[PDB]
Amino acid sequence: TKAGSLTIVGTGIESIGQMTLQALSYIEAAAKVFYCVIDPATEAFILTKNKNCVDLYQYYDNGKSRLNTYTQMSELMVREVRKGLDVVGVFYGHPGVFVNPSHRALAIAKSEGYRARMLPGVSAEDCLFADLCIDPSNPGCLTYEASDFLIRDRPVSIHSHLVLFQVGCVGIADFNFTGFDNNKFGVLVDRLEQEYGAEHPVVHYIAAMMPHQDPVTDKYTVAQLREPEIAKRVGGVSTFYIPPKARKASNLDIIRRLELLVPDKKARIYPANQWEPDVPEVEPYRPSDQAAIAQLADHAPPEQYQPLATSKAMSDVMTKLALDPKALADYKADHRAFAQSVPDLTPQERAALELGDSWAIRCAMKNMPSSLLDAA
Amino acid sequence: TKAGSLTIVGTGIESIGQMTLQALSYIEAAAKVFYCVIDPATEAFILTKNKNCVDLYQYYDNGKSRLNTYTQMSELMVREVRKGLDVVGVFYGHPGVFVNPSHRALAIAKSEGYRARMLPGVSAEDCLFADLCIDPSNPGCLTYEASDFLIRDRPVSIHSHLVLFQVGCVGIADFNFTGFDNNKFGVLVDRLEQEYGAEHPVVHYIAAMMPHQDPVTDKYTVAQLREPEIAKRVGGVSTFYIPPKARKASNLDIIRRLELLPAGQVPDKKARIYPANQWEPDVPEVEPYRPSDQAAIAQLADHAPPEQYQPLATSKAMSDVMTKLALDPKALADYKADHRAFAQSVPDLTPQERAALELGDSWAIRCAMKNM
Ligand SMILES: C[S@@+](CC[C@H](N)C(=O)[O-])C[C@H]1O[C@@H](n2cnc3c(N)ncnc32)[C@H](O)[C@@H]1O
Ligand SMILES: C[S@@+](CC[C@H](N)C(=O)[O-])C[C@H]1O[C@@H](n2cnc3c(N)ncnc32)[C@H](O)[C@@H]1O
Ligand SMILES: N[C@@H](CCO)C(=O)O
Known part of the structure; x- marks a missing residue:
């Protein structure tokens, strides 16, 4: 202690x-x-x-x-x-x-x-997903430090997203207040050309720092990164996004074992990745989409849907535990003593808070039956 | 518009x-x-x-x-x-x-x-880095959806971090209010055994949802995932972390091109950066205070800020308006529509501060807030 x-x-x-x-x-x-x-x-x-x-x-x-x-x-x-x-x-x-x-x-x-x-x-990667309009889920994401990527010859996957941090200081161990002299940047460009080809896109990404600023989201070819005027734009807050070059085929044995059956690999869910080369946009309103939309008109919540049904006293204390570090520390030290101190809680609410389990808090905040909590 | x-x-x-x-x-x-x-x-x-x-x-x-x-x-x-x-x-x-x-x-x-x-x-991955005490930088990170990982036979790297989302609903396209029946989970376990071996660690991760809870950070072997009581613990908010098997060797051409080691010296002999990944099997212990670390600490007693370091030197009025632009969406919209008219309206700004806000460029704001 x-x-x-x-x-x-x-x-x-x-x-x-x-x-x-x-x-x-x-x-x-x-x-x-x-x-x-x-x-x-x-x-x-x-x-x-x-x-x-x-x-x-x-x-x-x-x-x-x-x-x-x-x-x-x-x-x-x-x-x-x-x-x-x-x-x-x-x-x-x-x-x-x-x-x-x-x-x-x-x-x-x-x-x-x-x-x-x-x-x-x-993180800057969280910002990249939001500003470039991509999801790591589709079609997977590889994230590396640019120097480590080169020194350990880390594997590329041309079918997934690639994100490279610290592209502004390739091979540099020190610091300068005016900025890096990034004179080994050409070594990174050689690796990218060897893996992706001269005309493949590289997105130069800088998230906005100030609230009124727009992000930098500039597309270049790999070959363009050798031009001195382009290379000098890459600085200490620059990250590269390299989109997929191809789509990977589905494994037929796995589809059998998961029981889902031919699969067209070039058949995308809306929306398509805007940064992939020569990839057209998909239809947002297919007949299956229109059928799902038609069902909204007379929709009723399912019988097993449980709406929120709490009290001001309960929501106030749960908010306090998240926003007041001292209140949280007191609760963790003694659940029972803390729960007895909170004003205006019902007997069901006070017992649920003493326990602190997910099941108990949900029963109290959604007015669901519990023989134990209803006996309080 | x-x-x-x-x-x-x-x-x-x-x-x-x-x-x-x-x-x-x-x-x-x-x-x-x-x-x-x-x-x-x-x-x-x-x-x-x-x-x-x-x-x-x-x-x-x-x-x-x-x-x-x-x-x-x-x-x-x-x-x-x-x-x-x-x-x-x-x-x-x-x-x-x-x-x-x-x-x-x-x-x-x-x-x-x-x-x-x-x-x-x-995100849940942001929480995972914080709770498991790992950095995606060291030694790289691959992130996949578990069903996609299987269906497209996506590659692993035994020398980098692996993170798998949606391990509790393998091959499932629908929903159930009481939870998923995750009966294709064994297909994922088979793939992990093929790539890593039966005794390699897999960390079952669930970030705390309520502020008083601790995260689940339970290490299992790949083989333990076949045990019924263990498999049953994997649900709709579960993520898997699989650590590297070993450290990867360096490329010799790249060491030379980046001028990182003189000729005649053996590469890959420097000790790892402190601290080591605690989940990696057979990871050697790394010491926090080497000779180079102790020397840096000795220099603190007579450290002065470098000549090129620029201390903050702003005002209440300037800090207040920059905070307002970040916390009031209406004020930001007004500023974006007409910089000049907005900057004229702000109380107590100096003429230098007002002009800097009117321009809005990073160099201008930094000039005003550090008195350069
Ligand atoms: C020392 S690291 C720190 C990263 C930081 N902790 C984060 O959560 O993103 C510096 C690197 O972060 C990335 N970075 C920092 N600021 C950024 C920005 N505004 N836009 C894009 N990338 C950025 C760049 O790759 C940069 O070389
Ligand atoms: C539909 S996704 C949504 C993810 C969410 N948008 C995020 O930023 O993490 C659901 C998956 O997220 C992950 N997840 C959600 N909550 C989690 C938690 N508390 N701990 C660990 N992983 C979680 C699991 O892999 C889960 O199967
Ligand atoms: N990681 C370094 C350089 C990032 O460009 C730093 O400490 O700022």
Whole structure:
């Protein structure tokens, strides 16, 4: 039961708006905050929400290895944990997606016997899916760091989505405040041409940082990436999306074993991927679609559909547990004592909260029968 | 321009807390809200924020194809757009990650000339990285839908992370209110055994849905997945993580072209980055404080900010308006329509700040907020 803890949170990519409610609540409650963001409005916002913040960005330098910077960032955080304080680290995007020092600091804290947790956030890949209008499900997604992709000769799959981070710093171990001199970029272009061909599309993607900005979603051929004026547009916040070159055929034995039967591989569900070369759009309103739409006119909810049927007192406390870290800590320490303290709950509601199981909370908030809960 | 718009937003996975500030503000501002979420506290919260909501979940049914439900969900949203309304759709997690009807509705709205946008959210994969303590960077990540993975015989990489969604409904095209009868699950287990071997680990992952819950992070062998009591635990909110078998060797041409090692020295001999992946079988222990780490820590005592580091140096008025543009959708729409007229209306801005806002470029905003 050591005093001291480390919680690392994200801010998302687009200024302020892409932070989660829980990231904000933990920042506000912290004894000490350490942050690494690249948007001045987000920095200003953080400084209005906690009185004891330190900017980690000052530990980068011209010609200084990023690994040295990361060791320093982690040590600054853990030093405050060792003094018995509740410390929060903040990184832009998702704090564990292409971020070294967060994973390091949490592992050191855990090894010394302190509580340590990462809260997820909205990454640049999350933004890419939203802005390019693609789903990782169709037809699968491979995600790599650009230098690692080359050095370990990581496998390509020409039938799935490909996403490459850190294309602006190929083979570069250090930092510069004015930007990278990305003079090994041509090595990446050679690999892409060898796998996909000279005329295959590469989408240069930069998510908007400020709320009024449009994203950069510029299509180039692989061969165009050798032109000096195009290559120089690729910087420190650039990600590449490379769409599929072909569609993979279905396995007939698997279709038999799953029992689904010939399958046309070039037969798409609406909408088609706009970035695939020479792929026409599909029909949105086939006869099967029109039949489903006609059924709306006299639709009734199924008998097994259970509408929400809660109270203000119950919704208030469930919201409080999600938005007030201190209330959550009190509940976790003593479910029974906490449940007895909440004003205006019914006997059914109070018993369900003491248990805290999914089945019990659902019975209470949807007015479903339960012999135990109705006996309260 | 044409009246009517569609904005689709997410709620994250863990109840209420994983919703973004902008998802909340767009829900509040909407003329009508359509939602599909799978816990009651999140549903109750949404209903406190807008008086005009419809639950899309009522359009599922026992034995009804999910494709028919998806067509209906998308049509209810687009019908309201065609009436000239600003409509918001809401899906749990990230609204475009393993979600069919959002992409469909947005594509139809855009093709008919209406404004259409998706706002990203926190997905189950984002939660998985945070709870299992892994980074997609190290050593790469492949992500698939479980049935698609099987039907198209999609490749694995034994040297990278593998993440499989929808492992609880293999080959199933319909819906049931009481849950799926996942009787083709053995076909997935056979494929995993062929690619990885019977004793390789598979992590059964379920992110906590309520704020007091712990995640499920249960490691099993591929062979253990054939045991009835274990297979029964895999349901509609289950995801699988399969760690690498081993570390992959480096390409020698690439080491030379990137100038990463002098000739005559043996490659792939540096220790792994700390910390090691705790799920990878036979992973060696990595030490946190090597000589290079201890030297960096010694330098902290007399560290000064570099000359090129630019401290924030802004004002209440400028910070307030940039926050407003992020948190008030109406204010953002006004600003976008006429930058000059909006910037003239803002109270207490300096002439430098007012001009910077009127331009709106990143270089201009940064100049104003760091006093350069
Ligand atoms: C050090 S990593 C940090 C990523 C971050 N934690 C996240 O969640 O996306 C930096 C890389 O993230 C990607 N990135 C950062 N900001 C971006 C943006 N606005 N648009 C596209 N990619 C971005 C680029 O690939 C960049 O080289
Ligand atoms: C229809 S999809 C929707 C995914 C959602 N949009 C997201 O952003 O994660 C359903 C699948 O998501 C995954 N999933 C949903 N909730 C989850 C949870 N609490 N933990 C782990 N995986 C989950 C499972 O693989 C499930 O079969
Ligand atoms: N990962 C590096 C470079 C990203 O381009 C950083 O720490 O910013």
